[PDB]
């Protein structure tokens, strides 16, 4: 390597004096500078592998509703679906921003949502579903209301089918919402 460098110094001798280099400075020095800044610059890639497709909305498909009187059958399975599941207009955002004036947290935490995040689900109150019976379920609901003093629990459960094609893994989100029924209460007497 040294011998070849010395022979190119012989075959192409630069003038033995005050020879400033013309553009080979910009040829290889600027190459080194740009390459080395690029080594500082790959956090472009380190931040392009973070938070890319964030923004696809979880508009649900189905919403169901039950009402279980104790350990017996539900009174409803109202799977409210499309097109009765309706998204918002911007005037619906105006309605929420006007109906929730005297709370600051209401205004802030509704304004956190996009014009597509918040969807209605117009649930029909008229089920087309025969409430299934049996003379054990018949009589023991009557016994838990008339004779039974133990607290009957009424749940109110949900469902949400979400697009797995829109990303995300959790399809269904549910919560039970239990109210108990006291003995000699007005609710048990009216149901009896």
């Amino acid at each position: 390597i040294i011998k070849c460098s010395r022979e190119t110094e012989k075959k192409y001798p630069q003038p033995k004096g005050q020879k400033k280099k013309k553009i080979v400075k910009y040829g290889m020095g600027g190459l080194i500078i740009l390459f080395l800044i690029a080594i500082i610059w790959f956090p472009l890639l380190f931040m392009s592998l973070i938070r890319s497709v964030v923004g696809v909305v979880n508009q649900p498909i189905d919403v169901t509703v039950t009402l279980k009187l104790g350990g017996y059958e539900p009174l409803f399975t109202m799977s409210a679906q499309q097109p009765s599941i309706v998204p918002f207009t911007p005037q619906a955002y105006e309605e929420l921003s006007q109906q929730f004036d005297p709370y600051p947290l209401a205004m802030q935490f509704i304004s956190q949502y996009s014009p597509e995040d918040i969807v209605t689900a117009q649930i029909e109150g008229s089920s087309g579903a025969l409430w299934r019976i049996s003379p054990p379920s018949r009589a023991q609901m009557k016994q838990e209301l008339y004779n039974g003093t133990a607290d009957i629990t009424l749940r109110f459960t949900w469902n949400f089918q979400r697009d797995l094609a829109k990303g995300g893994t959790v399809e269904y989100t549910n919560e039970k919402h239990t109210l108990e029924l006291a003995p000699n209460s007005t609710a048990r007497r009216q149901l009896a």
């Binding site: 500082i40 973070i50 497709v53």
Partner: protein, 89 residues
């Protein structure tokens, strides 16, 4: 909304920028140590010696290989003989 997929990985950014940092500092900061073996004038005699060793490796006269190799080792054990043996003339 959907996020379909920090603090423990920016430290691995600082890890890889330090590794490449001292990797480029390999090319710098220690070449004054190598001036006495690479910044030398006319190198004709040592190519004569190395090509002597190669053809002696062909002709299997290996005593000449060991004696020429003792010339190489002693040329690289004494930089003032490197100055003698690599003048320009």
């Amino acid at each position: 909304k959907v996020s379909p997929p920090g603090y423990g990985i920016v430290g691995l950014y600082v890890s890889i920028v330090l590794v490449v940092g001292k990797f480029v500092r390999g090319f710098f900061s220690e070449i004054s140590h190598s001036i006495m073996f690479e910044e030398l004038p006319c190198v004709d005699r040592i190519l004569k010696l190395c090509q002597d060793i190669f053809l002696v490796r062909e002709t299997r006269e290996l005593e000449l290989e060991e004696e020429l190799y003792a010339k190489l080792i002693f040329l690289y054990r004494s930089p003032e003989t490197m100055i003698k043996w690599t003048r320009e003339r």
